[PDB]
Write an enzyme that holds these catalytic residues in place. Sequence first.
Site, short mmCIF file in Angstrom:
data_model
loop_
_atom_site.label_atom_id
_atom_site.label_comp_id
_atom_site.label_asym_id
_atom_site.label_seq_id
_atom_site.Cartn_x
_atom_site.Cartn_y
_atom_site.Cartn_z
N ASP A 16 0.84 -1.19 0.00
CA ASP A 16 0.00 0.00 0.00
C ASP A 16 0.88 1.24 0.00
O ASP A 16 1.46 1.60 1.03
CB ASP A 16 -0.94 -0.01 1.21
CG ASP A 16 -1.84 1.21 1.27
OD1 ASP A 16 -2.06 1.85 0.22
OD2 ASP A 16 -2.33 1.52 2.38
N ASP A 52 -1.33 5.41 -5.66
CA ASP A 52 -1.78 4.58 -4.54
C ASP A 52 -2.06 3.17 -5.03
O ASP A 52 -3.08 2.93 -5.68
CB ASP A 52 -3.02 5.19 -3.90
CG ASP A 52 -3.41 4.49 -2.61
OD1 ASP A 52 -2.81 3.44 -2.29
OD2 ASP A 52 -4.32 4.99 -1.92
C1 LIG Z 1 -10.63 1.30 5.11
C2 LIG Z 1 -9.87 1.29 6.44
C3 LIG Z 1 -10.63 0.89 7.53
C4 LIG Z 1 -10.08 0.78 8.79
C5 LIG Z 1 -8.73 1.03 8.94
C6 LIG Z 1 -7.95 1.37 7.84
C7 LIG Z 1 -8.48 1.40 6.55
C8 LIG Z 1 -7.55 1.87 5.62
C9 LIG Z 1 -6.29 1.30 5.67
C10 LIG Z 1 -5.30 1.62 4.74
C11 LIG Z 1 -5.61 2.48 3.69
N1 LIG Z 1 -4.67 2.81 2.79
C12 LIG Z 1 -4.94 3.64 1.78
N2 LIG Z 1 -3.97 3.92 0.90
C13 LIG Z 1 -6.20 4.20 1.62
C14 LIG Z 1 -6.56 5.16 0.49
C15 LIG Z 1 -5.73 6.46 0.56
C16 LIG Z 1 -5.89 7.36 1.81
O1 LIG Z 1 -6.94 7.97 2.00
N3 LIG Z 1 -4.86 7.44 2.65
C17 LIG Z 1 -4.95 8.27 3.87
C18 LIG Z 1 -4.19 7.84 5.15
C19 LIG Z 1 -4.63 6.51 5.79
C20 LIG Z 1 -4.43 5.35 4.85
C21 LIG Z 1 -6.10 6.63 6.16
C22 LIG Z 1 -3.81 6.28 7.06
C23 LIG Z 1 -7.19 3.88 2.54
C24 LIG Z 1 -6.88 3.01 3.59
C25 LIG Z 1 -7.86 2.64 4.50
#
Ligand SMILES: Cc1ccccc1-c1ccc2nc(N)c(CCC(=O)NCCC(C)(C)C)cc2c1
Length: 361
Positions: free
Chosen positions: A34, A219
């Site tokens: 990721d 991403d």
């Molecule tokens: C969907 C979700 C639910 C509970 C906990 C974490 C996640 C999560 C985990 C890793 C992720 N990794 C990603 N690259 C993304 C999409 C991009 C994004 O918005 N990144 C922001 C920072 C962060 C990933 C939220 C820490 C979303 C994600 C969502």
Amino acid sequence: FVEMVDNLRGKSGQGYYVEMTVGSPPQTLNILVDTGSSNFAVGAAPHPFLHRYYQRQLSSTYRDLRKGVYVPYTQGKWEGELGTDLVSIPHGPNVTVRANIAAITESDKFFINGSNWEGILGLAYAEIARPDDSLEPFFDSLVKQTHVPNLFSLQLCGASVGGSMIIGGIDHSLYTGSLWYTPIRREWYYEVIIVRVEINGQDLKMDCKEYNYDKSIVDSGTTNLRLPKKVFEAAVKSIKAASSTEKFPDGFWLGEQLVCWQIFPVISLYLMGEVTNQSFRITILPQQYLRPVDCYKFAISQSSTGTVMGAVIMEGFYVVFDRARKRIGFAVSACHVHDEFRTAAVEGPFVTLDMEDCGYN
Ligand SMILES: Cc1ccccc1-c1ccc2nc(N)c(CCC(=O)NCCC(C)(C)C)cc2c1
């Protein structure tokens, strides 16, 4: 880097994962790759969806940081207990690094029922790590503690998906033509600047700031091409136009329906180049943004946090995360799905003025 070739597996829409080991003796886990996050977080409790989990009680090299971390998302969350331990990548470089590990103890809508991964490898920078930027991300620890060069490259080849993560180098067998580099605007996400967008060769004639409203990132964790609403609205309006031979409902464009048959326009993104007033363009086929889920969904959607170049973009290109030189390389992937009339392409150089004005402040 032969043994790192094909070290990525996964299922359609469930991300790409790599095999890793944690603790002494090594505990094997499948870990999502990721580039849109910065935490190395692994399941550490018998969640019913998990094939396996980090068992800290079995690791003599485990060290407790005695501090939790809480990571909420849109109605979901994961939270865990911070520590360090020895980490290796069996089909990666032959090194062992002591890295921060977030032992996931509680989650919601994070793990996927039926998937084959148990944790997530955040490859972005410390600024977006939780709880703060003092939790050194994995790749930073890898580079500091070994002589692995400060870069990695990803070839995502979208049943089962496959791909390659080349840690610390570039495998030129994985791409054709030349690599073209776009600067990493800032080291938090892998942020880049889109300077021009074309549908089937026709420019959208929008102020390029809209293409990066808030930001634009690369991403591997996101499935779709996510464009800002106003750019998405203008983008679909153009894709709708060239797609008049066949008419679907309006909701299909917002991600609400699939249809099988058992002519679409190509999407071109112009990225800021390495030289003043110089850009290059990457072009994807319908085989990228119409994901099978011979049926297919529409893999372009709107966003509030800016442009997200997800698997729809990355699966057509070999992508080089040149951290050492603060740039991202694109080249035509030797594994991307293409018919015999059109091909994914990386072209340059082009002349584009006021590319810096395309970034949001
Ligand atoms: C969907 C979700 C639910 C509970 C906990 C974490 C996640 C999560 C985990 C890793 C992720 N990794 C990603 N690259 C993304 C999409 C991009 C994004 O918005 N990144 C922001 C920072 C962060 C990933 C939220 C820490 C979303 C994600 C969502």
